[PDB]
Curated annotation (Swiss-Prot):
The active site is at E35, D52. In the egg white and polymorphonuclear leukocytes. This is Lysozyme C. Monomer. The keyword Hydrolase applies. Lysozyme C is capable of both hydrolysis and transglycosylation; it also shows a slight esterase activity. It acts rapidly on both peptide-substituted and unsubstituted peptidoglycan, and slowly on chitin oligosaccharides. It comes from Gallus gallus (Chicken). The lineage of its organism: Eukaryota, Metazoa, Chordata, Craniata, Vertebrata. The keyword Signal applies.
Length: 129
């Protein structure tokens, strides 16, 4: 499913991401935008053999199991395919574990290079939240 900007903001807000660990809703929507362009079915293979899955492009090396990433962790205890669902629940719950890991949202390369330090509030403008 390809989410609309405001549609995703409402879904994330409902799942408790607004201000989660200090990150305003705009940050999460901005990350999703540049990580997957709001597409829950986005996948991307990396040089190390791991793959990124879903709206927030969660990596198979540490967070989910896809059966083809040797010696990888499944810290979120879920098959990576679950992160491609039109229902973002799995993605959101795993993201909450990732952002609490220590480096905050810097774990997401797109957020660090394209959202961090910008006017992220602009991503939820005009939305009925």
């Amino acid at each position: 499913k390809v989410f609309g900007r405001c549609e995703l903001a409402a879904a994330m807000k409902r799942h408790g991401l607004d201000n989660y660990r200090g990150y305003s809703l705009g940050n999460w929507v901005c990350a999703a935008k540049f990580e997957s362009n709001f597409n829950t079915q986005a996948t991307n293979r990396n040089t190390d053999g791991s793959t990124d899955y879903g709206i927030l492009q969660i990596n198979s090396r540490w967070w989910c199991n896809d059966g083809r990433t040797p010696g990888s962790r499944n810290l979120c205890n879920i098959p990576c395919s679950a992160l491609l669902s039109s229902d973002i629940t799995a993605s959101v719950n795993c993201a909450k574990k990732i952002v609490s890991d220590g480096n905050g949202m810097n774990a997401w390369v797109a957020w660090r290079n394209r959202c961090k330090g910008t006017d992220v509030q602009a991503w939820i403008r005009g939305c009925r939240l």
